[PDB]
Amino acid sequence: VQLVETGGGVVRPGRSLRLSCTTSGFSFSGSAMHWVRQAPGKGLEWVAVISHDGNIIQYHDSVKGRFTISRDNSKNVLLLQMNSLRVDDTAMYYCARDVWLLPATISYAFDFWGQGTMVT
Amino acid sequence: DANFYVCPPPTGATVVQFEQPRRCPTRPEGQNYTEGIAVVFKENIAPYKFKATMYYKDVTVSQVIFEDRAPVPFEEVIDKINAKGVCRSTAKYVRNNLETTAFHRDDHETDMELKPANACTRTSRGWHTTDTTVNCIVEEVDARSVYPYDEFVLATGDFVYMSPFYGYREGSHTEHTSYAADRFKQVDGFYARDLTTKARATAPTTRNLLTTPKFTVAWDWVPKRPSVCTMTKWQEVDEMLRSEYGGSFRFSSDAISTTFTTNLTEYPLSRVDLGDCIGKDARDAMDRIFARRYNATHIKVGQPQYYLANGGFLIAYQPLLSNTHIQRPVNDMLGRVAIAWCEEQNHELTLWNEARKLNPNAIASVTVGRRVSARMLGDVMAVSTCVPVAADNVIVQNSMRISSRPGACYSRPLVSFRYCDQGPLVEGQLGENNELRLTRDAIEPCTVGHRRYFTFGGGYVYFEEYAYSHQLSRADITTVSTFIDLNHEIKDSGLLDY
Amino acid sequence: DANFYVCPPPTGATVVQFEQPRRCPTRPEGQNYTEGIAVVFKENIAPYKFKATMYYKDVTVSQVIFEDRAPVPFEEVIDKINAKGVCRSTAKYVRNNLETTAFHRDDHETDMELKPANACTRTSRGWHTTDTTVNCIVEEVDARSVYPYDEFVLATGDFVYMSPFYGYREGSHTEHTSYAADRFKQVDGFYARDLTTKARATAPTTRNLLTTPKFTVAWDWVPKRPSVCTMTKWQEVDEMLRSEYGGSFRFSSDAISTTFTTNLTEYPLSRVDLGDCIGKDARDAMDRIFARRYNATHIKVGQPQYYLANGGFLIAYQPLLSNTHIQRPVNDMLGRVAIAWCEEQNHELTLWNEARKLNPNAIASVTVGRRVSARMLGDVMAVSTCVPVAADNVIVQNSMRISSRPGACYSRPLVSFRYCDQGPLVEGQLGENNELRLTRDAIEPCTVGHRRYFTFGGGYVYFEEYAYSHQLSRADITTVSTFIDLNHEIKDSGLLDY
Amino acid sequence: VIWMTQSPPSLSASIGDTVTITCRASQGISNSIAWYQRRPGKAPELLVYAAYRLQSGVPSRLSGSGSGAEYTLTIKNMQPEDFATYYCQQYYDNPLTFGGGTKVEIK
Ligand SMILES: *[C@@H]1O[C@H](CO)[C@@H](O[C@@H]2O[C@H](CO)[C@@H](O[C@@H]3O[C@H](CO[C@H]4O[C@H](CO[C@H]5O[C@H](CO)[C@@H](O)[C@H](O)[C@@H]5O)[C@@H](O)[C@H](O)[C@@H]4O)[C@@H](O)[C@H](O)[C@@H]3O)[C@H](O)[C@H]2NC(C)=O)[C@H](O)[C@H]1NC(C)=O
Ligand SMILES: *[C@@H]1O[C@H](CO)[C@@H](O[C@@H]2O[C@H](CO)[C@@H](O)[C@H](O)[C@H]2NC(C)=O)[C@H](O)[C@H]1NC(C)=O
Ligand SMILES: *[C@@H]1O[C@H](CO)[C@@H](O[C@@H]2O[C@H](CO)[C@@H](O)[C@H](O)[C@H]2NC(C)=O)[C@H](O)[C@H]1NC(C)=O
Ligand SMILES: *[C@@H]1O[C@H](CO)[C@@H](O)[C@H](O)[C@H]1NC(C)=O
Ligand SMILES: *[C@@H]1O[C@H](CO)[C@@H](O)[C@H](O)[C@H]1NC(C)=O
């Protein structure tokens, strides 16, 4: 199982950015998905979550509204978008797969990650 | 078994309806399963209450008329009643399509002091002046307001199209009012003098004053009372399975327990944060059951889920997972028995409908759980609690053969009683199930061959030819079984040679 | 919960009775046992049906009389009503013990064309001429015939003492007829013109024509319709024990299941071969259960046995034999519970008997499983389905205070509605449980002090002093439980100071 | 928001020792907390879920415990692969939040 993130790069504050994460090696259609952020040299900090079906979404208060998350099983890709990044938003991002316990539940955790993409 | 009771006709302040048919969960599961702790919530619907006060005046004319209530002006309430505890004699009212003024026993204008009108404190205090004639009355009636707190009703049953939070002192629900501003006033610094002793209150208060064309009302005012949770924690279930079928998740507990059904969609009340108290209580109950029974048995996964199940029940579920045979058939039997019970009770609901129309007193009392008065006001039933009276203050009249109407006399015994031991005595009729009617109207064409019994206290009171004979204990009459347990003596022939 | 409903009085076409007391198997087994597969049957009793047509004429006189129906001759039915689509004006009938002829609005003899009489198709089409006077009417009513197919009745409720198979064209059940031959005719080659468009049928047919002194009837005739089994496969039980005691074999299944009892003698229906389809269906049932559950568990023995059980049931048993503990007490306890249920339900049947005499509408509807009309025609109940109408086509009148009779006005709200959206509107009264009465007769001596509610759609309609105020949702009235689950809030006092 | 703390930020040990780490939440979650570790130059990997359950690949010498708002993770023996960083993650209330973390290095 592996995940691949794309769309990062050095960007000045005051503009939008679009990025996505492709999935492979597992049942992406039957598993939820997470998004995490990590500033340079700092700890981990959650961003958002999308269920396996996509009818329920939750975000972090620091990124609510400013960021959006979307998925598509036909192309096994996780799409995200945002607007007007600030200087504090400079951080490392990854797409994390939720811990699989039952099909009708979301663990609100994660067990698999991808390579990640950096944004500054 | 119980003491006597007096049930005045209900005023319609509180109305009740049937539970209506309930959907039975016909299938006793058997498909895929999932485990988790559960706690169900439902509409709190707690109605606000406030012991308001009612002020009005009675008007009459000595013509061998057209009497009706009249309101009390605000100036009279704060000046004569609030200061001196007296009421004005003159009062204007429409008489045969034209205004006319009344007087106190056709005398000049005078001030009549208010005195208690109950004769003994058995209910709210209440006050009056006299037992053309005019009478001023004041009563500290109770009140109720629906869950939205937009309208309220008093004990008299007259709806008030105005929210109790109305007031221009601060930001409140002042936009909800159907009456004109001339019919409302908010008195600040009100000291609320009492008519029992005229000793004044302990501190000043702001009191709202409103008056409908029929009367005047008032009650202490506060800005708002938003301290209320929308839902109430109804039941806490230790084990509840989450099954999936028919495009609607099913939440079932032990066989005889009630099963819920939802739309499979998470309700947004919790994630919106408007149900913060609901989540707090639900989360506390969820952790309580887990630590109480599943620390090492299961493992909690995810976060609690919420669904607006069928029938309005808000179920809060928390999935669980296990860390790791004769019950199979019996569970199916018990489940089928439970469904039969739900279906049988659903049919019984119909029988209860005609029963209320036939006898609302007994039916309404047993349904609510206590002796309560009731009458059918159409398709909706009215309710009002009854007042109790001890046996010593009740005595049956020697005979119901009213000599005023020979050949047609009362069918049930006439009873005399007193509400309070030191209070005055009253006369009435003995109804069914120790119900003391306040009126005597059970006339019947009394004819020869009469011999009957009537419930009186713990035993019965015998009668024959419309004349009292003696009492009879409970064991003095043979008993039959009007039931069937989970597991007879009748005889004698009639007098054919009459 | 449901839309409005209009229930016309039943015509007595279909009558219903109770199941009557059922014998409960008091003994919960415990004696010797034997195993085998089982499948029960009962009388098929499927009644034959045919959409017949009734032809008649109404006759009246302009005396400031003695109106009654009149039949239509055969020649006029096939020629004027069918081929031409008109009706004769003159019609003879008895008037005060003597024959007399009528006319079309006291005019000359004329031919009046037929038109639909429903104004919007909500039921059978039906046709008429005009909304001394004579009116010609035709109706394609429905019909039913008892299981023997010897007699039939139409929607109007008038029994026809002649079987639907009557006919002299071929060898049929022509021996059964109580009317004279002059009252019957079989029109051969009838090519059936229709009154809706006069497009005429597709192929010629033979139509029977009979006419009672009250009207004329007809329907397409066939030689015979004997394709029906005398019994119907009711239930297929996977496991059923065969116990022996009391000189009558007992066939019992799972504890909560119903137990049968027979005379221990094989019935001769199967061996006589008349129940060939019964044996085929039964034999298929035994094989289905055997291959489904007992290929290697048990072994068949002999052939299926047939017995006429108590209550009219027919049981087809196939004994089995096995090729090779906590359930003991619970089974006895559950069995006793089932018997208590049967005995308790037996007692409840008496309650239902009094309930129907008190309110046949609601009781008849819940018992059959849907909103249905009903009235007690003595000791037997009549039944007829009701017609539904959407809420949008219904509106409550502003007030029931009929000014024509002051002091005595309608007790329930007066309602106006239209059967079809584009059809004309009608006036009536709002009954109980959303029942739209087609007539207004609920007069009551309306007096001061009135405040009631009435069921309307999903919510309630409020009223005070006989005047509409506003609507009220279901949640606007407090609810109370009327049935106890397998596992309260009432308050307020009356106005004693009135 | 629910906060938590982890200490010490880093510690020096050696193969064959015994160490334990603690994560103290700001409220009584009572059971909803996970743990994670990360190797240098590689993505993190999970350790514990609900403070008690393990997963595949993790050695048997790994086990967590706790209750209320005090939670700990115990490592019974040190090995060359243990010289890495560890963290605690709560999921009792949203948004999800991570702990201060810890680090391990050879003496
Ligand atoms: C009826 O009820 C059942 C039981 O509740 C429903 O779910 C099925 O349950 C069976 C039995 O457990 C499942 O069969 C198993 O499924 C697994 C599929 O693997 C998925 O996860 C893999 C990675 O996650 C694992 O590994 C990491 C660590 O590496 C752990 O943290 C995780 O917890 C997991 O162990 C992925 O690679 C893979 O692609 C999958 O996403 C697998 O462990 C087993 O091989 C086994 O097959 C079955 O999959 C469940 N069904 C579904 C659809 O998921 C069942 O759905 C219910 N029926 C209906 C109709 O709803
Ligand atoms: C559960 O599903 C039912 C299906 O009937 C939903 O019913 C809705 O009812 C409203 C009433 O005004 C209609 O406007 C909607 O169109 C109905 N929806 C559908 C999909 O038919 C009901 O609201 C649903 N409940 C929840 C909590 O989602
Ligand atoms: C089972 O036994 C009963 C016993 O009463 C049979 O009852 C018969 O009823 C008819 C009614 O006309 C009488 O003429 C018979 O004399 C009765 N028979 C006896 C033996 O008393 C009943 O018919 C029997 N049923 C079957 C299917 O055999
Ligand atoms: C729960 O069980 C575990 C073992 O599975 C035990 O170590 C722990 O102390 C228990 N926790 C509580 C809070 O009782
Ligand atoms: C029934 O069981 C036997 C063994 O007792 C097996 O050999 C046979 O195939 C089975 N028959 C059928 C029809 O399934």
From TrEMBL, chains B, C:
Residues in Herpesvirus glycoprotein B ectodomain C-terminal domain copies: 325-498
Domain Herpesvirus Glycoprotein B PH-like, residue spans: 44-229, 231-324
Keywords: Disulfide bond, Glycoprotein, Host cell membrane, Host endosome, Host Golgi apparatus, Host membrane, Host-virus interaction, Membrane, Signal, Transmembrane, Transmembrane helix, Ubl conjugation, Viral attachment to host cell, Viral envelope protein, Virion, Virus entry into host cell
One Gene Ontology biological process: virion attachment to host cell
Keyword hit for Glycoprotein: yes
Residues spanning the signal sequence: none
Any one Gene Ontology cellular component term annotated for this protein: viral envelope
UniProt function note: Envelope glycoprotein that forms spikes at the surface of virion envelope and binds to the host cell entry receptors MYH9/NMMHC-IIA and MYH10/NMMHC-IIB, promoting the virus entry into host cells. Essential for the initial attachment to heparan sulfate moieties of the host cell surface proteoglycans. Involved in fusion of viral and cellular membranes leading to virus entry into the host cell: following initial binding to its host cell entry receptors, membrane fusion is mediated by the fusion machinery composed at least of gB and the heterodimer gH/gL.
Entry protein name: Glycoprotein B
The species this protein was found in: Human herpesvirus 1 (HHV-1)
Residues of the full protein shown: 110 to 702 of 904
